[PDB]
């Protein structure tokens, strides 16, 4: 029943300070467990940042200790992370997670010598850049007679020229999950990203049903809901 949700800025200027917050429902951050922060740079592995227990006791990665701060708000069931003097090496997806209690001495039952991360959040993407945020231009990819494959047909949305990542696309407010494929973004020579989301639908139900793609770009605090009508 335990759910975690990170929240952050998405874009941080170099030498700035990154501030994230993980809200917890169905569990208590004031417990003896170790509520942790993990990050994963794009195309790389996981790196451990720190942990906090009972809302007070902290433990950090030795290589990051000089600029990492983890605090907890026991009244809002939240714990937060603060990383100062950021560079491009701090660009990563930041996960909050939960580790179990343990013993530092070799004198405890067997249950207290595990480390595992069984509960994770979805992760929030953070980019360290001096470039400015740009919201996306959403265009409809309307179905035609060449986007058809017999009984089915393809329609989509072009999410063009945005920065930074990520962009999430749902269809009909999440009611339409079958047949949806959101393609990974392309990094263009301008420094801006672009991606496309495409959903496959019955060609007979084109004129009898409305299809809207929901494009969320949190780094710019913009949501675009574009209606897709046949060509």
């Amino acid at each position: 029943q335990v759910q975690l949700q990170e929240s952050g800025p998405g874009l941080v200027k170099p030498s700035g300070t990154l501030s994230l917050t993980c809200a917890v429902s169905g569990g208590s951050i004031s417990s003896s467990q170790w509520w942790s922060w993990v990050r994963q740079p794009p195309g790389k592995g996981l790196e451990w940042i720190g942990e906090i227990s009972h809302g007070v006791y902290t433990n950090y990665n030795p290589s990051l200790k000089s600029r990492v701060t983890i605090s907890a708000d026991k009244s809002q069931n939240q714990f937060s992370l603060n990383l100062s003097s950021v560079t491009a090496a701090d660009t990563a997806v930041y996960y909050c997670a939960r580790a179990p209690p343990y013993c530092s001495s070799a004198s405890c039952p067997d249950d207290y010598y595990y480390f595992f991360l069984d509960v994770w959040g979805k992760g929030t993407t953070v980019t360290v850049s001096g470039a400015s945020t740009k919201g996306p231009s959403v265009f409809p990819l309307a179905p035609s007679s060449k986007s058809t494959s017999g009984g089915t047909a393809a329609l989509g949305c072009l999410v063009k020229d945005y920065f930074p990542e990520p962009v999430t696309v749902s269809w009909n407010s999440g009611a339409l999950t079958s047949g949806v494929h959101t393609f990974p973004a392309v990094l263009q020579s301008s420094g801006l990203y672009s991606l496309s989301s495409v959903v496959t639908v019955p060609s007979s139900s084109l004129g009898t049903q409305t299809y809207i793609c929901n494009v969320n770009h949190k780094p710019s605090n913009t949501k675009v809901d574009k209606r897709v009508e046949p060509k």
Binding site: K44, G45, E47, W48, Y102, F139, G156, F183, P184
Partner: protein
Amino acid sequence: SSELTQDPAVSVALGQTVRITCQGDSLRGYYASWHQQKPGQAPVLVIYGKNNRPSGIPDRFSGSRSGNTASLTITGAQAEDEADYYCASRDSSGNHPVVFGGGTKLTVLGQPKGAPSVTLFPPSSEELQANKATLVCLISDFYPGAVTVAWKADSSPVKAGVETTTPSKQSNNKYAASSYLSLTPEQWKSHRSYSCQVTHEGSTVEKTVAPT
């Protein structure tokens, strides 16, 4: 960043057994856990430690120890096992910081090949009414992940204005790619047709769009 050494990539044939190993002097004090990560998703714990597994993890996953080396063995590997695997534990000295392995890309051989699905879209009315023109060629569901994308103006190759991704694995172990061709509305209307050619394992799929 990483403290335990894993092989960055190992392979196993569908149905065979593979042992992904995790080594380091930091390991000797605590139990090693294993985390699985599919593309585009957060990690998923597959081994608590020792040989304990959470719910939803098949019996073919198992954990074992041999001093400073932990091992995740997969007996009878399936296609759903293709992912990245991370061992984790705590340092037995000092303030006991958490210790991650570098990660291991697991490839499962013998999966069925697949021809690419190619979807080509012309520039939308709203984009042209805004004095912009972009051609979108979406390639998906091809295996292996080797594919060449090429654009044609009428029948002549075009290279300027083409932005292509490198193939990336989908959640169903097949691959996807995208190529965007940016033109002016004059370039779009001054040609009879435009084409997106996609070659995969010696075979080519070609889609064509016109100002119609």
